[PDB]
Amino acid sequence: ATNHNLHITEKLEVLAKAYSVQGDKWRALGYAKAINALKSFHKPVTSYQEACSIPGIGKRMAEKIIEILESGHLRKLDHISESVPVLELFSNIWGAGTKTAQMWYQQGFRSLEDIRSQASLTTQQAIGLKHYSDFLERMPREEATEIEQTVQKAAQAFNSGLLCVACGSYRRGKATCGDVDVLITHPDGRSHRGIFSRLLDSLRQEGFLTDDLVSQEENGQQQKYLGVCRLPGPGRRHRRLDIIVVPYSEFACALLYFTGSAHFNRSMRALAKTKGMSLSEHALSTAVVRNTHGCKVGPGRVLPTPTEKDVFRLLGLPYREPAERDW
DNA sequence: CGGCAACGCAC
DNA sequence: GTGCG
DNA sequence: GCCG
Ligand code: NA
Ligand code: NA
Ligand code: NA
């Protein structure tokens, strides 16, 4: 879908990025949703009233949209802190968010070399810094495929019945991916247990995993690994890789969650909410039991969902293919 | 005005 | 408990 | 920022 409001959305993206790097995530979110709507509008926006009519665009956003449209500029841009470029630079380091970026900036740091030479770094941040360039690039989906096949080969050697699927943007069909998230499970509902640890060991022994950001995270019955991998061969770059092992009964909800996108997951959680349910990476459940003070006193009950279609069905929604889940 | 999800891990 | 993804 |  052609963007008939490019000059507009271009200036709005710069402002949104400013808010995002300085910590105002909620304000940045609002901009991102409004920007999406603009890029996909059938024609160049021509009036404030019309702008206001689009879902996601309120008075404030319409006010800026019309300003750019009629004046060609957005004055709010000329008042952006000069620090934004550096705050984005620092926040591009895996493990370093806005607060850390802010702190380093207040210490006078301005470049990556400054960081490497004078900044205090967590273990995760040091790995993120040393792979700065590799991690900022989006890999061709062809490489993500090789990464997924590598994990799957190691996994299936332990149990040929395991089901492995790369999620994230890869599953949504994008030509390039910022990372690879391999979701692993077993149809018999129990054989996924005792795989996670030895799978990581096997991949580590074979030289595929090069650094661990979080060797193991236990979220209910789900086990997650966050790390760094590199395919064999000269010229290969280091890439971000997550491996998640889950019980079959939660496979559909895990698939949906890790496939995303982050915006799609938000709309689905909100929608589940309007229907007295909650949707997480674990399951689709009925609303939690609350007391006189609207406080969690008892978990809602899990509504079994064998496949993603079941989740949409129970939510009264038409099924949506992964490629259609950017928003 | 408050919600926009909730959570685990590193520190 | 803060920060991060 | 947007929305109820
Ligand atoms: Na600003
Ligand atoms: Na970061
Ligand atoms: Na507010």
Coordinates of C-alpha atoms (C1' of nucleotides) and ligand atoms in Angstrom, one line a residue:
Chain A
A1 CA 0.0 0.0 0.0
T2 CA 1.5 3.3 -1.2
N3 CA 2.1 6.0 1.4
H4 CA 0.3 9.1 0.2
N5 CA 1.5 11.1 3.2
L6 CA 5.2 10.5 3.2
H7 CA 6.4 14.0 3.9
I8 CA 4.1 14.0 6.9
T9 CA 4.9 10.5 8.3
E10 CA 8.6 11.3 7.9
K11 CA 8.5 14.2 10.2
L12 CA 6.3 12.4 12.7
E13 CA 8.7 9.4 12.8
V14 CA 11.6 11.7 13.8
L15 CA 9.6 13.2 16.7
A16 CA 8.4 9.7 17.8
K17 CA 12.0 8.4 17.8
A18 CA 12.9 11.4 20.0
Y19 CA 10.3 10.5 22.6
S20 CA 11.2 6.8 22.4
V21 CA 15.0 7.4 23.1
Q22 CA 14.3 9.7 26.1
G23 CA 12.1 7.2 27.8
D24 CA 8.5 8.4 27.0
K25 CA 7.5 5.0 25.7
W26 CA 3.8 5.5 26.0
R27 CA 3.9 8.8 24.0
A28 CA 6.1 7.0 21.4
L29 CA 3.6 4.2 21.1
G30 CA 0.8 6.6 20.4
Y31 CA 2.9 8.1 17.6
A32 CA 3.7 4.7 16.1
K33 CA 0.0 3.7 15.9
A34 CA -0.9 7.1 14.3
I35 CA 1.9 6.9 11.9
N36 CA 0.8 3.4 10.8
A37 CA -2.7 4.7 10.0
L38 CA -1.3 7.5 7.9
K39 CA 1.0 5.5 5.7
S40 CA -2.0 3.3 4.9
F41 CA -4.6 6.0 4.3
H42 CA -6.2 6.0 0.8
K43 CA -5.2 9.6 0.0
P44 CA -3.1 12.5 1.1
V45 CA -4.8 13.8 4.2
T46 CA -6.5 17.1 3.2
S47 CA -8.4 18.3 6.4
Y48 CA -8.2 18.3 10.2
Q49 CA -11.7 16.9 10.4
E50 CA -10.6 14.0 8.0
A51 CA -7.5 13.4 10.0
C52 CA -9.5 13.3 13.2
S53 CA -11.8 10.7 11.7
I54 CA -9.0 8.1 11.4
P55 CA -8.8 5.7 14.4
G56 CA -5.5 6.4 16.2
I57 CA -5.4 10.1 15.4
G58 CA -6.7 12.6 17.9
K59 CA -6.8 16.4 18.1
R60 CA -3.1 16.6 19.0
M61 CA -1.9 14.4 16.2
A62 CA -4.3 15.9 13.7
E63 CA -2.9 19.3 14.7
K64 CA 0.6 18.3 13.7
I65 CA -0.6 16.5 10.6
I66 CA -2.3 19.6 9.2
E67 CA 0.6 21.8 10.2
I68 CA 3.1 19.8 8.1
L69 CA 0.6 19.5 5.3
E70 CA 0.0 23.3 5.1
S71 CA 3.3 24.7 6.2
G72 CA 5.6 21.9 5.0
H73 CA 7.2 21.8 8.4
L74 CA 6.9 20.7 12.0
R75 CA 8.2 23.3 14.3
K76 CA 8.3 20.8 17.2
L77 CA 11.3 19.3 15.4
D78 CA 13.5 22.4 15.9
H79 CA 13.2 22.0 19.6
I80 CA 14.5 18.5 19.9
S81 CA 17.4 17.9 22.3
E82 CA 20.7 17.7 20.5
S83 CA 21.4 14.6 22.5
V84 CA 18.9 12.4 20.7
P85 CA 21.4 11.0 18.1
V86 CA 23.7 9.9 20.9
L87 CA 20.9 8.5 23.1
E88 CA 19.8 6.4 20.1
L89 CA 23.3 5.3 19.6
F90 CA 23.7 4.1 23.2
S91 CA 20.3 2.6 23.3
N92 CA 21.1 0.5 20.2
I93 CA 23.3 -1.5 22.5
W94 CA 21.6 -4.7 23.6
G95 CA 21.0 -4.4 27.4
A96 CA 21.1 -0.6 27.5
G97 CA 17.8 1.2 27.5
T98 CA 16.9 4.8 27.9
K99 CA 18.0 5.2 31.5
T100 CA 21.5 3.8 30.9
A101 CA 21.8 5.9 27.7
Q102 CA 20.8 8.9 29.8
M103 CA 23.3 8.1 32.5
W104 CA 26.2 7.6 30.1
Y105 CA 25.3 10.9 28.4
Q106 CA 25.3 12.8 31.6
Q107 CA 28.8 11.4 32.1
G108 CA 29.8 13.2 28.9
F109 CA 30.1 10.0 26.8
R110 CA 29.2 10.5 23.1
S111 CA 30.6 7.6 21.1
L112 CA 30.8 3.9 21.3
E113 CA 34.6 4.2 21.9
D114 CA 33.8 6.4 24.9
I115 CA 31.5 3.5 26.1
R116 CA 34.1 0.8 25.4
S117 CA 36.8 2.8 27.2
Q118 CA 35.1 4.6 30.1
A119 CA 31.6 3.2 30.8
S120 CA 30.7 0.6 33.4
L121 CA 29.0 -2.2 31.5
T122 CA 26.8 -5.1 32.6
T123 CA 27.7 -8.6 31.3
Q124 CA 24.8 -8.4 28.8
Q125 CA 25.7 -4.8 27.7
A126 CA 29.4 -5.8 27.0
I127 CA 28.2 -8.6 24.7
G128 CA 25.8 -6.2 23.1
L129 CA 28.5 -3.6 22.6
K130 CA 31.0 -6.0 21.1
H131 CA 28.4 -7.1 18.6
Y132 CA 27.0 -3.7 18.0
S133 CA 27.2 -3.7 14.3
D134 CA 26.3 -7.4 13.8
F135 CA 23.1 -6.9 15.9
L136 CA 22.0 -3.7 14.2
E137 CA 21.8 -5.4 10.8
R138 CA 18.7 -7.3 9.8
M139 CA 19.7 -10.7 8.4
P140 CA 18.3 -12.1 5.1
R141 CA 15.5 -14.5 6.0
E142 CA 17.6 -17.1 4.2
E143 CA 20.1 -16.9 7.1
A144 CA 17.4 -17.1 9.7
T145 CA 16.3 -20.3 8.0
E146 CA 19.8 -21.8 8.4
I147 CA 19.8 -20.8 12.0
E148 CA 16.4 -22.5 12.6
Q149 CA 17.6 -25.6 10.8
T150 CA 20.7 -25.7 13.0
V151 CA 18.8 -25.6 16.3
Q152 CA 16.2 -28.1 14.9
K153 CA 18.9 -30.5 13.9
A154 CA 20.4 -30.4 17.4
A155 CA 17.0 -30.8 19.0
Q156 CA 15.7 -33.7 16.9
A157 CA 18.9 -35.7 17.6
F158 CA 17.6 -36.0 21.1
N159 CA 14.0 -36.7 20.1
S160 CA 12.8 -36.9 16.5
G161 CA 9.3 -36.1 17.4
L162 CA 10.1 -32.5 18.6
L163 CA 8.4 -29.7 16.6
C164 CA 10.6 -26.6 16.0
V165 CA 9.4 -23.3 14.5
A166 CA 11.1 -20.0 14.0
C167 CA 8.7 -17.2 15.0
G168 CA 9.1 -13.4 15.1
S169 CA 9.3 -11.4 11.9
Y170 CA 10.6 -14.5 10.1
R171 CA 7.3 -16.4 10.5
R172 CA 5.5 -13.2 9.5
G173 CA 7.2 -13.6 6.2
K174 CA 9.6 -10.6 6.2
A175 CA 12.6 -10.6 3.8
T176 CA 15.0 -9.7 6.6
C177 CA 14.9 -10.3 10.4
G178 CA 16.4 -8.6 13.4
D179 CA 16.7 -12.0 15.2
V180 CA 15.5 -15.5 15.3
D181 CA 13.2 -17.0 17.9
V182 CA 13.0 -20.8 17.7
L183 CA 9.9 -22.2 19.6
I184 CA 10.3 -25.9 20.4
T185 CA 7.6 -28.4 21.7
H186 CA 6.5 -32.1 21.4
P187 CA 3.0 -33.3 20.4
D188 CA 2.9 -36.1 23.1
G189 CA 2.8 -33.3 25.7
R190 CA 5.7 -34.5 27.8
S191 CA 8.8 -35.2 25.8
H192 CA 9.8 -31.6 25.6
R193 CA 11.0 -31.9 29.2
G194 CA 14.8 -32.5 29.7
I195 CA 15.6 -31.1 26.2
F196 CA 16.4 -27.4 26.8
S197 CA 19.6 -27.9 28.8
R198 CA 21.2 -30.5 26.7
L199 CA 20.2 -28.8 23.5
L200 CA 22.0 -25.7 24.7
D201 CA 25.0 -27.8 25.6
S202 CA 25.0 -29.5 22.2
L203 CA 24.8 -26.2 20.4
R204 CA 27.5 -24.7 22.7
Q205 CA 29.9 -27.7 22.2
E206 CA 29.5 -27.4 18.4
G207 CA 30.6 -23.8 18.5
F208 CA 27.2 -22.4 17.3
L209 CA 26.3 -20.4 20.5
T210 CA 29.0 -17.8 21.2
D211 CA 27.6 -15.8 24.1
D212 CA 24.7 -16.1 26.5
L213 CA 22.6 -13.0 27.5
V214 CA 20.4 -15.1 29.8
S215 CA 21.3 -18.8 29.9
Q216 CA 18.0 -19.8 31.3
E217 CA 14.7 -18.1 32.1
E218 CA 11.9 -20.1 33.7
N219 CA 8.4 -18.8 33.1
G220 CA 5.9 -21.4 34.4
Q221 CA 6.5 -24.5 32.3
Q222 CA 8.3 -22.5 29.5
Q223 CA 12.1 -22.4 29.4
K224 CA 13.8 -19.6 27.5
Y225 CA 17.3 -18.9 26.3
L226 CA 18.5 -15.5 25.1
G227 CA 21.9 -15.6 23.4
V228 CA 24.2 -15.1 20.5
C229 CA 24.9 -17.5 17.6
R230 CA 27.0 -17.7 14.5
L231 CA 26.7 -20.1 11.6
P232 CA 29.8 -22.0 10.5
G233 CA 31.8 -20.5 7.6
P234 CA 34.0 -17.5 6.8
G235 CA 32.3 -14.1 6.7
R236 CA 29.3 -15.1 8.9
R237 CA 28.1 -12.5 11.4
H238 CA 27.0 -13.0 15.0
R239 CA 23.1 -13.0 15.4
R240 CA 20.6 -12.7 18.2
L241 CA 18.9 -16.0 19.0
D242 CA 16.2 -17.0 21.5
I243 CA 15.2 -20.6 22.1
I244 CA 11.9 -21.3 23.9
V245 CA 10.8 -24.8 24.9
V246 CA 7.2 -25.2 25.9
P247 CA 4.6 -27.9 26.8
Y248 CA 2.3 -28.8 23.9
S249 CA -0.8 -27.5 25.7
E250 CA 0.6 -24.0 25.5
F251 CA 2.0 -24.3 22.0
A252 CA -0.7 -22.3 20.2
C253 CA -0.5 -19.4 22.6
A254 CA 3.3 -19.4 22.6
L255 CA 3.3 -19.5 18.8
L256 CA 1.0 -16.5 18.6
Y257 CA 2.9 -14.5 21.2
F258 CA 6.4 -15.1 19.8
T259 CA 5.2 -14.5 16.3
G260 CA 3.8 -11.1 17.2
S261 CA 4.2 -8.5 16.2
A262 CA 4.3 -6.5 19.4
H263 CA 1.4 -4.3 18.2
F264 CA -0.6 -7.4 17.2
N265 CA -0.1 -8.9 20.6
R266 CA -1.4 -5.6 22.2
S267 CA -4.5 -5.6 20.1
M268 CA -5.2 -9.2 21.0
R269 CA -4.8 -8.7 24.7
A270 CA -7.0 -5.6 24.6
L271 CA -9.6 -7.5 22.6
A272 CA -9.5 -10.5 25.0
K273 CA -10.1 -7.9 27.7
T274 CA -13.3 -6.6 26.2
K275 CA -14.5 -10.2 26.3
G276 CA -13.7 -11.0 29.9
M277 CA -10.5 -12.9 29.0
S278 CA -6.8 -12.5 29.1
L279 CA -4.2 -13.7 26.6
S280 CA -0.6 -14.4 27.4
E281 CA 2.2 -16.5 26.0
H282 CA 0.9 -19.4 28.2
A283 CA -2.8 -19.4 27.5
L284 CA -6.2 -17.8 26.8
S285 CA -8.0 -17.7 30.1
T286 CA -11.2 -16.4 31.6
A287 CA -10.9 -13.2 33.7
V288 CA -9.1 -13.5 37.0
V289 CA -11.2 -13.6 40.2
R290 CA -11.2 -10.2 42.0
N291 CA -12.3 -9.0 45.4
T292 CA -14.0 -5.8 46.6
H293 CA -10.9 -3.9 45.7
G294 CA -10.6 -5.2 42.2
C295 CA -7.5 -7.2 43.1
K296 CA -6.2 -10.6 41.9
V297 CA -7.3 -13.2 44.4
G298 CA -7.6 -16.1 42.0
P299 CA -6.5 -17.0 38.4
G300 CA -9.1 -17.4 35.7
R301 CA -9.4 -20.8 34.1
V302 CA -7.5 -21.8 31.0
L303 CA -9.6 -22.3 27.9
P304 CA -7.8 -25.1 25.9
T305 CA -6.5 -23.9 22.5
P306 CA -4.8 -26.6 20.4
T307 CA -4.0 -24.3 17.5
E308 CA -3.8 -20.6 16.9
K309 CA -7.2 -20.8 15.0
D310 CA -8.8 -22.0 18.3
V311 CA -7.5 -18.8 20.0
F312 CA -9.1 -16.6 17.3
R313 CA -12.3 -18.8 17.3
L314 CA -12.7 -18.5 21.1
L315 CA -12.2 -14.7 20.8
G316 CA -14.8 -14.4 18.1
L317 CA -12.3 -13.3 15.5
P318 CA -11.6 -14.4 11.9
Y319 CA -8.3 -16.2 11.7
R320 CA -5.3 -14.0 10.6
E321 CA -2.3 -15.5 8.8
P322 CA 1.1 -14.6 10.3
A323 CA 2.0 -12.3 7.4
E324 CA -1.1 -10.2 8.2
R325 CA -0.1 -9.6 11.8
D326 CA 2.1 -6.5 11.6
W327 CA -0.6 -4.6 13.4
Chain B
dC1 C1' -7.3 10.8 34.5
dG2 C1' -5.5 6.1 34.2
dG3 C1' -4.6 2.1 31.1
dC4 C1' -1.7 0.8 27.2
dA5 C1' 0.2 -7.0 30.0
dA6 C1' 2.9 -9.3 32.7
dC7 C1' 7.0 -11.3 33.8
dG8 C1' 12.0 -13.2 34.9
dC9 C1' 16.5 -12.2 35.3
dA10 C1' 20.7 -9.3 36.2
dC11 C1' 22.2 -6.0 39.7
Chain C
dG1 C1' 13.4 -2.3 43.9
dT2 C1' 15.2 -0.4 39.1
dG3 C1' 16.2 -1.4 34.4
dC4 C1' 15.6 -4.1 30.3
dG5 C1' 13.7 -7.0 26.5
Chain D
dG1 C1' 0.1 10.3 22.2
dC2 C1' -4.8 7.7 21.9
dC3 C1' -9.1 6.0 24.1
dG4 C1' -13.0 5.1 27.3
Ligands
NA1 NA 10.7 16.2 22.4
NA2 NA 19.1 -1.2 24.0
NA3 NA -1.4 11.1 30.6

